[PDB]
Amino acid sequence: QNLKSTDRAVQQMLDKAKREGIQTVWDRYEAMKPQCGFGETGLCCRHCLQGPCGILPFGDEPKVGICGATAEVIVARGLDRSIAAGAAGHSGHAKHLAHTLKKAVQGKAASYMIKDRTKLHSIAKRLGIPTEGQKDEDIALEVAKAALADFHEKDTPVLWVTTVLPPSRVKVLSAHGLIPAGIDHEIAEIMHRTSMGCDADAQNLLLGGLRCSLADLAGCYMGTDLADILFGTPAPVVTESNLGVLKADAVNVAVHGHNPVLSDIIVSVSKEMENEARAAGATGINVVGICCTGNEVLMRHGIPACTHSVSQEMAMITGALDAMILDYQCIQPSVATIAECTGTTVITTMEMSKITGATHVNFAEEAAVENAKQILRLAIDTFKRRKGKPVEIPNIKTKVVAGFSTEAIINALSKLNANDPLKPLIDNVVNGNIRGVCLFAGCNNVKVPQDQNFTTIARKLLKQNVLVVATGCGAGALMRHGFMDPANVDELCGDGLKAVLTAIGEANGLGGPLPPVLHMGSCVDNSRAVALVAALANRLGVDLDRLPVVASAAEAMHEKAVAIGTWAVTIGLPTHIGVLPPITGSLPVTQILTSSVKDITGGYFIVELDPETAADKLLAAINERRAGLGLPW
């Protein structure tokens, strides 16, 4: 089981699944091997009914697609389509929040409201929207109108790109025609250009991909901003993670997926439904989190995290999960089958995201609280059905400190310098206490033993004094292995990083250091690390491609992660990916994405499947940036 996951509770549940004959993601992976080399390398195209076209990586024919598409064209077109799909996911998340805010301030969804008015004012000022003498409701109405308008062509380019990156960075990208014209415009234009008999030049295609990745960034940043306006900006919180956060004696309700719009309401309504759950004979309603929706309610409300990503099925294997409430993205459709063996009620709520065999509750913001009650009532019923059943929850959980938004980080730092809060952090970079900054992002991938790359690379970087922040299921992997527990700072962090974490935490009324890794939220909250990095850039006078900041999608799975890696490259970062992406069938494209892109954006991909090597390479990139600033290392 140790080749499947490094998580001990996941191993316990894999044993139970094998005992009980429940098929798992790892079993389906085992039945899939050997996987196809054409697809694995990118050398396969189906954008034509003349296809499929396979191109051998090496040897004799076939050497070219039927229409004459070369290997680099096929590879570049495939990658471009996956960037557009990732952009479309983060896009739809943010679009739906934009509609929710619009509905809220127009009196149509009373379950929603402006919870963060300082943020609303910040965003409106950054966008050039006038605040002075305006009603909050009208400022928010303008901010939502701008959000929706960034999806199409207009007078201006995408404001959630051009107003969130330092002007020098915007000038670099715009001299290469990389500034998106509208989010959905870019997605559709990718789909156009990559269809048969269109763009057939790898450089041209990859430039389009960089532009589309920035559309994805805009969607992430939009979603973050709007969820913060709607639901509050995260501040540091203490909670727990892993399967042991489940309780045999409560109604256990997992919120799963990505959009917090419904699950924040679920969190707030379950509090009221406590008394009714307890009339059914439960101790209460125990809302836990899975994947990014879970991270949203962990960041804002301290909801404990049950599990993430490749291991989501294992929550159900305990027999104590009574409801799994989905919205969309990264939900294994297998849950709906597995529920028939475990008694969990799987509930979808989004019209475009349904799974055959799952109960559907048609969620509308205009009836949010009503929907919530209905859904939790189903959960309560399911708990009744397992009154006295034996459950096996592994008694494994870690302590998690999280809620480190960029605003929270800046406030924490301001306790060391109120008038120039980024300065303490910059000072410790300059004197070597902080070697650089590494963002861990992305998901788990069944091909990599779960969390192994995240934890190995993290361990090496922390010993070398790299400040580590994390999002999405990368945050999830690090939190389930103790990396967000301050009590591990001694074992994990080199002396200088230890000193800075201790200084900031003791200055923040915690009596202890900050945790070894700063949890910055969901996959859309990858934009938060942009806002931090951008701010450092601005405070220092230099473009992003000169900062000792790096990013690692250590176990990337989802098309969203490919779009995110591509916009970490486009805004200027060295960007490790720890899973093989479908680029190795073409040397020209690999060369562009790992080398010559440096001469356009300053970022570049680092493709490295071995995590010790990947950590060396990330440390080398950080130290190259240090030397470029004239710093020691």
**For residues 290 and 315, is the Cβ–Cβ distance under 8 A?**
yes
| 292 marked as binding residue | yes
Which among 580, 582, 586, 563 is positioned nearest to 65, based on CA atoms?
A: 586
Radius of gyration of the chain, Cα coordinates, nearest whole angstrom: 24
In angstroms, what is the minimal distance from the CB of 199 to ligand SF4? Answer: 11
Question: Whose Cβ is closer to ligand FES: residue 39's or residue 244's?
Answer: 39
DSSP assignment of 84-141: HHHHHHHHHHHHHHHHHHHHHHTTS-TT-----HHHHHHHHHHTT---TT--HHHHHH
Choose the one of a second copy, Fe ion, ligand FES, none that binds residue 53, judging by a C-beta under 5 to 8 angstroms depending on kind: a second copy
Q: What is the pattern of x (binds ligand SF4, CB under 6 A) and - over residues 39-78?
A: ------xxxx-xx-x-----------xxx-x----x----
In angstroms, what is the minimal distance from the CB of 401 to a second copy? Answer: 28
Choose the one of ligand FES, ligand SF4, a second copy, none that binds residue 330, judging by a C-beta under 5 to 8 angstroms depending on kind: a second copy
Touching ligand SF4, residues 164-183 (CB under 6 A): none
Contacts of 507 (CB under 8 A, 6+ apart): 412, 415, 416
In angstroms, what is the minimal distance from the CB of 585 to ligand FES? Answer: 11
In angstroms, what is the minimal distance from the CB of 600 to ligand FES? Answer: 30
Choose the one of ligand SF4, a second copy, ligand FES, none that binds residue 271, judging by a C-beta under 5 to 8 angstroms depending on kind: none
Tokens linked to 100 = 């929710």
Question: Whose Cβ is closer to Fe ion: residue 196's or residue 580's?
Answer: 196
Kindly report the length of the chain: 633
Out of 27, 54, 535, 616, the residue judged to bind ligand FES by CB under 6 A: 54
Question: Whose Cβ is closer to Fe ion: residue 439's or residue 600's?
Answer: 439
Euclidean distance between CA atoms 372 and 349, whole angstroms: 10
**For residues 375 and 121, is the Cβ–Cβ distance under 8 A?**
no
How remote is the C-alpha of 310 from its chain's centroid? Answer: 14
Parallel, antiparallel or unpaired: strands 549-553 and 574-577: parallel
Choose the one of ligand SF4, Fe ion, a second copy, none that binds residue 558, judging by a C-beta under 5 to 8 angstroms depending on kind: a second copy
Q: Which residues pair with 469 in a beta bridge?
A: 439, 518
Question: Whose Cβ is closer to ligand FES: residue 51's or residue 512's?
Answer: 51
* CA angle at 271 for the pair 317 and 396, rounded to the nearest 5°: 35
In angstroms, what is the minimal distance from the CB of 50 to ligand SF4? Answer: 4
Question: Whose Cβ is closer to a second copy: residue 120's or residue 355's?
Answer: 355
Rounded to the nearest 10°, the torsion over CA 404, 405, 410, 412 is -30
Question: Whose Cβ is closer to a second copy: residue 22's or residue 531's?
Answer: 22
Choose the one of ligand FES, Fe ion, ligand SF4, none that binds residue 106, judging by a C-beta under 5 to 8 angstroms depending on kind: none
Name the residue number minimizing CB distance to ligand FES: 39
Out of 9, 13, 25, 44, the residue judged to bind ligand FES by CB under 6 A: 44
Longest dimension (CA), the chain: 72
| 330 marked as binding residue | yes
Parallel, antiparallel or unpaired: strands 305-307 and 517-521: unpaired
Check residue 35 and report its DSSP letter: P
| 220 marked as binding residue | no
Question: Whose Cβ is closer to ligand SF4: residue 41's or residue 318's?
Answer: 41
Euclidean distance between CA atoms 598 and 605, whole angstroms: 9
Tokens linked to 186 = 């870019």
| 443 marked as binding residue | yes
Region of 193 on the Ramachandran plot (φ > 0 left; ψ -120 to 50 alpha; else beta):
alpha
Phi, psi for 306 (deg, rounded to 5):
-80, -55
Rounded to a whole number, what is the distance in angstroms from the first to the last CA of the chain?
A: 40
Out of 98, 187, 267, 291, the residue judged to bind Fe ion by CB under 5 A: 291
In angstroms, what is the minimal distance from the CB of 34 to ligand FES? Answer: 11
User: In three state form, how does the secondary structure of 221-263 look?
Assistant: HHHHHHHHHHHCCCCCEEEEECHHHCCCCCEEEEEECCCCCCH
Which among 358, 341, 340 is positioned nearest to 349, based on CA atoms?
A: 358
| 438 marked as binding residue | no
Euclidean distance between CA atoms 247 and 277, whole angstroms: 14
Q: Which residues pair with 471 in a beta bridge?
A: 521
Choose the one of ligand SF4, ligand FES, Fe ion, none that binds residue 4, judging by a C-beta under 5 to 8 angstroms depending on kind: none
Contacts of 89 (CB under 8 A, 6+ apart): 258, 328, 329, 558, 559, 560
Touching ligand SF4, residues 73-112 (CB under 6 A): 74
| 48 marked as binding residue | yes
Name the residue number minimizing CB distance to ligand SF4: 48
Phi, psi for 213 (deg, rounded to 5):
-60, -35
* CA angle at 199 for the pair 196 and 202, rounded to the nearest 5°: 120
Helices 117-126 and 202-231 pack at an angle, to 10 degrees, of 150
In angstroms, what is the minimal distance from the CB of 43 to ligand FES? Answer: 8
Q: What is the pattern of x (binds ligand FES, CB under 6 A) and - over residues 3-42?
A: ---------------------------------x-xx---
Question: Whose Cβ is closer to a second copy: residue 291's or residue 619's?
Answer: 291
How remote is the C-alpha of 617 from its chain's centroid? Answer: 23
Which among 47, 80, 83 is positioned nearest to 195, based on CA atoms?
A: 47
How remote is the C-alpha of 504 from its chain's centroid? Answer: 26
Choose the one of a second copy, ligand FES, Fe ion, none that binds residue 88, judging by a C-beta under 5 to 8 angstroms depending on kind: a second copy
Question: Whose Cβ is closer to ligand SF4: residue 65's or residue 565's?
Answer: 65
In angstroms, what is the minimal distance from the CB of 364 to a second copy? Answer: 14
Name the residue number minimizing CB distance to Fe ion: 291
Touching ligand SF4, residues 195-234 (CB under 6 A): 196
Question: Whose Cβ is closer to a second copy: residue 67's or residue 170's?
Answer: 67
| 341 marked as binding residue | no
Question: Whose Cβ is closer to Fe ion: residue 285's or residue 330's?
Answer: 330
Scanning 77-85, 178-186, 248-256, 289-297 for contacts with Fe ion by CB under 5 A, the matching segment is 289-297
- Write out the residues near ligand FES by the rule CB under 6 A: 36, 38-39, 44, 46, 52, 54
| Residue ranges binding Fe ion (CB under 5 A) | 291, 309, 330, 473
Q: Which residues are annotated as a binding site for [4Fe-4S] cluster?
A: 36, 44-45, 48, 53, 67
Binding-site entries for [Ni-4Fe-5S] cluster: 258, 292, 330, 443, 473, 523
Binding residues: 36, 44-45, 48, 53, 67, 258, 292, 330, 443, 473, 523
**Which residues sit at the interface with ligand SF4, rule CB under 6 A?**
45-48, 50-51, 53, 65-67, 69, 74, 196
